[PDB]
Every structure is written in structure tokens, then in C-alpha cells.
Design a protein around this nucleic acid. Structure first.
Ligand code: NA
Ligand code: NA
Length: 327
DNA sequence: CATCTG
DNA sequence: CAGATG
């Protein structure tokens, strides 16, 4: 957590560059397990050889460690941090919908900046467009102060279109968290389930409404159960208008709402721990269900959920308020 | 994993 | 359809 700090840190710094600049998924994958292991390691690694002794730790890495422990730097790391080429890739990518794969092709055509982008707006798809349009707006985090106002609005709407809908704004929001990164509502409906053969309107009907009132300003992608777009709070009495923000909407069969809802509320940690224990309790869990675990190795058959309560209970536990689902 | 491009 | 993004 701090005794192998730099090691795992330069490790990760490399892994990144493998995957992002080079297409080097293998190496990327390499740099990664090591950074994980020296990470879980208890000693203050003092040498490459000490290190090498570890699974994951080969020789290439062991060498970089020696050089690093030897000098405050690493050259390869120093060379990469300059390379206008390697830089551009970390940049472009920042753009919504510009992945690495893309980041390359652009840079090669020589699209290196926002300016470059704008100039060639023609070559980017719709997604990358919105993405470039709201680049600032998208980096800013969301205040819970706006978070509430947002949720207020969405919640009123859905109810409006159908009393039978169920929505929830998961995430950090859900945990307290003074600020979010983007919004995600989890949708459901009595009339939506595992077996029930669809109801698409179910998603679109609400989407529609969102725009009717003009909250949702653009669509990133819409499908039959998942929606990805842009939104905005109305600007009061003209002088102060809100930044454009990211939002996601998604359909769930009323039969797996809770698990999703649980799951999606996080944190990741509260998840595994819940998960690990649920294993003891002779259970199994994922984003969708809870299954009575068999002995013969594994077993299934979905247990019933009516609130995040039912699940907790299943595994015999303390029902947590979202606030305390940290870890 | 679900949507999108093409 | 493969491949990419989130
Ligand atoms: Na991106
Ligand atoms: Na292939």
C-alpha cells in the first residue's frame, strides 16, 4: 500500500503505455500482474532479484526494478513522457468515444489536439462529436447539489409516464458522495421480467419524456435496454446555465433489480466482501441474482428478492444503509 | 455487455 | 459480421 509504492507505480505507468500506445495487450497484461503482486507483497523489496522470486516477476521487469531502485527514474518511462506521439494518445482518448485504436489513426493523420479535432469534425462519429463538443463539461464532476436536482427531475418524470415504474439512481450518489462523475438510473417495471418477453417502449417511453421536458439534450446511443446520452438542468433566471452532463438509463426485469441495484451501488469493495461472505453463507452472487449454492461443486436456482434487504438476509447479514456500503 | 460503425 | 467504445 506504500512500501512498494513506486514499484507498483512505475509498473502500472508501463502497463498503460503497453495497452494504450503499443497495442501490447500481452505486455500490458504482464506489467499488470506484477504490479498486483509486488503490491500484495509484504516486504520492502530491495532488489530486482528479490523481486524476481515472485510469480509474475520475470526478468524484464526485474531489470526495470533494479534500475528504478538504483535511480529515481527509469529511462523508458522518461522517454515515453516526452514522446509527442505517446502523449497525444493519452490525450485524444480523453475524448468520449475516442478510444486508443482511434487515438492512433488520428494522430497518424496528425490529429493531435482539440483544435485538430474541431478542424476535422467531419471524421469523427456522432459519439465523438458530442464528445468533442462537451469536452470541458464532461470533465467536471457533478455536485450532489445538482445531483439531487437531477434525480428530482427524472424521478418526477418517470412517475409521470407510469406509476408502475421503478427507478433508482445508483452510484456514489446513492452512498452519500458529495460529487458524481455521471448519472445512472436503474429502471424497472412490474411488467418486466426474466421471462416476460420484452417491452421496449418501456425504455423509450421514458427516454422520450426526458427530452419532452428537455432534460436529455442528446443521445449517445440507445438500444433496447440501455441508453447513453447527455443532459442538462435548466438554467434558472438567465445568468447561470449548467454544464452538460453524462447519463445512462437501463432496463431491468423486475426480477433482478435488487441485485443490479445492490451491485451498482458499490463500492467495489463492499461488493466482494458481501460476495465473499455470501459464499460462506452457502450462496452466490452477481449483478443479477443470488443463488442457493450446492455442495457437489456448484449449484443454482434464483432466490427471491424484493428489496436489497432480502439479499442481505439471505446471507444473514446486517442490512447496510447505502452510506455505510464503503467497505 | 450492449450498442455502433461500417 | 468484426471490432471498438463505454
Ligand atoms: Na475516450
Ligand atoms: Na481476430
Amino acid at each position: 500500500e506504500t512500501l512498494n509504492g513506486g514499484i507498483t507505480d512505475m509498473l502500472t505507468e508501463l502497463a498503460n503505455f503497453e495497452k494504450n500506445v503499443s497495442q501490447a495487450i500481452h505486455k500490458y497484461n504482464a506489467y499488470r500482474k506484477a504490479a498486483s503482486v509486488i503490491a500484495k507483497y509484504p516486504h520492502k523489496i530491495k532488489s530486482g532479484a528479490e523481486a524476481k522470486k515472485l510469480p509474475g516477476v520475470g526478468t524484464k521487469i526485474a531489470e526495470k526494478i533494479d534500475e528504478f531502485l538504483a535511480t529515481g527514474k527509469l529511462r523508458k518511462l522518461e522517454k515515453i513522457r516526452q514522446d509527442d506521439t505517446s502523449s497525444s494518445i493519452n490525450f485524444l482518448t480523453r475524448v468520449s468515444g475516442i478510444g486508443p485504436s482511434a487515438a492512433r489513426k488520428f494522430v497518424d493523420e496528425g490529429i493531435k489536439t482539440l483544435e485538430d479535432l474541431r478542424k476535422n469534425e467531419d471524421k469523427l462519429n456522432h459519439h465523438q462529436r458530442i464528445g468533442l463538443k462537451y469536452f470541458g463539461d464532461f470533465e467536471k464532476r457533478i455536485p450532489r447539489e445538482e445531483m439531487l436536482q437531477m434525480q428530482d427531475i427524472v424521478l418526477n418524470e418517470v412517475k409521470k409516464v407510469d406509476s408502475e415504474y421503478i427507478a433508482t439512481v445508483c452510484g456514489s450518489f446513492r452512498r452519500g458522495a458529495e460529487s458524481s462523475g455521471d448519472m445512472d438510473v436503474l429502471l424497472t417495471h412490474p411488467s418486466f421480467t426474466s421471462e416476460s418477453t420484452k417491452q421496449p417502449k418501456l425504455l423509450h417511453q421514458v427516454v422520450e419524456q426526458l427530452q419532452k421536458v428537455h432534460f436529455i439534450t442528446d443521445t449517445l446511443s440507445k438500444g433496447e435496454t440501455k441508453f447513453m446520452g447527455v443532459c442538462q438542468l435548466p438554467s434558472k433566471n438567465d445568468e447561470k446555465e449548467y454544464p452538460h452532463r453524462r447519463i445512462d438509463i437501463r432496463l431491468i426485469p423486475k426480477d433482478q433489480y435488487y441485485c443490479g441495484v445492490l451491485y451498482f451501488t458499490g463500492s467495489d469493495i463492499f461488493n466482494k466482501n458481501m460476495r465473499a461472505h455470501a459464499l460462506e453463507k452457502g450462496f452466490t452472487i452477481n449483478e443479477y441474482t443470488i443463488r442457493p449454492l450446492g455442495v457437489t461443486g456448484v449449484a443454482g436456482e434464483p432466490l427471491p428478492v424484493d428489496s436489497e434487504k432480502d439479499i442481505f438476509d439471505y446471507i444473514q447479514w446486517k442490512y447496510r444503509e447505502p452510506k455505510d456500503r464503503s467497505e
